[PDB]
From a paper:
We found that while Rv1045 encodes the guanylyltransferase TglT (unusual type guanylyltransferase-like toxin), which arrests bacterial growth, Rv1044 encodes the atypical protein kinase TakA (unusual type of atypical kinase antitoxin), which neutralizes the activity of TglT via phosphorylation. It encompasses an N-terminal domain (NTD) and a C-terminal domain (CTD). The NTD (1-181aa) exhibits an α/β fold that commonly found in nucleotidyltransferase-like proteins. A large central cavity is formed between NTD and CTD.
To shed lights on the origin of TglT phosphorylation, we determined the crystal structures of a selection of mutants, S78A, D82A and E146Q. On the contrary, while no electron density was observed for S78 phosphorylation in the crystal structure of TglT mutant E146Q expressed alone, we observed clear electron density for a phosphate group connected with residue S78 side chain in the TglT mutant E146Q structure co-expressed with TakA, resembling the structure of the wildtype TglT. Surprisingly, mutant E146Q (motif 2a) exhibited toxicity similar to the wildtype protein. We next compared the initial growth rates of E146Q, D82A and wildtype TglT, which revealed a clear difference 4 hours after induction. While the growth rate of D82A exhibited negligible differences from the plasmid control, the growth rate of E146Q was significantly lower. Thus, E146Q mutation on motif 2a led to attenuated toxicity rather than complete loss of function. The E146Q mutant exhibited toxicity similar to the wildtype TglT, which was rescued by TakA.
Numbering used by the authors: 3 to 292
């Protein structure tokens, strides 16, 4: 019943995925995106400095999915990361890793392009991983890489997933991730940011993720989070800490979209209530002292 040998080919891989997905009550494409992200994460985890410490830390929706599992996280499409080396090093090192492969998977990477960002001195980079399994195209993963901000690569959490185990690929999964205080600081900054009026802030989904991150801090001391929030807001030199969690007129349905699949969790059910919850979190962070 549990596969004793790895999938012999793509078709066998897809067949085992659909079985696992049906078995777990998960959408096939969701499980497939998760497995592909994991494979890319394993490539990224081979990138170390000359002391063996990670060069790339995972963040964003991939991190939340690793922290909470598929049933308890938003569907997201990006593999978002933070690097401690230049993009040119990162892209070249990833391409090598993807050529060497991992457990039958290989990847080729499109070229990095810069993206518009006002608070980062170094512009983020974005490209794509074309994944294959035993020679045959398998999946596409959008990748984003941003440079360090303040202390947000000083430490990392190491998370895992058994999804590849469940389809007969047993090699341990271990993914270095940006820690929760920095995920909170960056999402709080993004969800409260005011953009230039050609552009509009659509990040209502960050209100969902911020509730999930507050839940994951449990009763932790908030002081590291407060320090991280201060550091990110001062570093970006835009709106000041503590921000106001405002809602824009088009956010009600975006927030509703972001709740898809999470009916079983205790989340704010309306964007107003979500803004109120995250504002209370902001105040709670700001109160921290010891
Ligand atoms: Mg096949
Ligand atoms: Mg299914
Ligand atoms: Mg390092
Ligand atoms: Mg994800
Ligand atoms: Mg992903
Ligand atoms: Mg710092
Ligand atoms: Mg193992
Ligand atoms: Mg705003
Ligand atoms: Mg609504
Ligand atoms: Mg969403
Ligand atoms: Mg729901
Ligand atoms: Mg609820
Ligand atoms: Mg409130």
């Amino acid at each position: 019943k549990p596969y004793s040998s790895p999938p012999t080919n793509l078709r066998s891989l897809r067949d085992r995925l659909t079985q696992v997905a049906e078995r777990q009550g998960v959408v096939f494409g969701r499980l497939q995106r998760h497995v592909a992200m994991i494979v890319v994460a394993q490539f990224a985890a081979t990138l170390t400095d000359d002391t063996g410490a990670p060069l790339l830390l995972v963040k964003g929706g991939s991190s939340l999915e690793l922290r909470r599992g598929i049933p308890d996280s938003r569907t997201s499409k990006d593999f978002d990361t933070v690097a401690r080396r230049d993009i040119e090093l990162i892209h070249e090192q990833l391409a090598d890793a993807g050529e060497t492969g991992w457990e039958g998977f290989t990847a080729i990477f499109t070229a990095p392009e810069e993206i518009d960002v006002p608070g980062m001195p170094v512009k983020p980079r974005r490209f794509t991983a074309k994944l294959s399994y035993r020679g045959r195209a398998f999946a596409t993963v959008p990748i984003q890489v941003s440079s360090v901000e303040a202390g947000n690569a000083d430490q990392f959490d190491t998370l895992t997933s058994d999804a590849l185990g469940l389809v007969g690929v047993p090699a341990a999964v271990a993914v270095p991730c940006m820690t929760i205080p920095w995920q909170i600081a960056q999402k709080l900054h993004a969800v409260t940011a005011v953009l230039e009026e050609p552009k509009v802030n659509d990040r209502a989904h960050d209100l969902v993720d911020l509730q999930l991150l507050e839940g994951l801090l449990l009763d932790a001391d908030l002081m590291p989070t407060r320090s991280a929030c201060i550091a990110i807001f001062e570093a970006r030199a835009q709106h000041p800490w503590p921000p106001r969690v405002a809602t824009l007129p088009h956010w009600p349905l975006i927030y509703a979209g972001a709740l898809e699949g999470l009916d079983h969790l205790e989340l704010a059910r309306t964007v107003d209530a979500a803004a109120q919850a995250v504002q209370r979190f902001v105040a709670r962070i700001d109160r921290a002292t010891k």
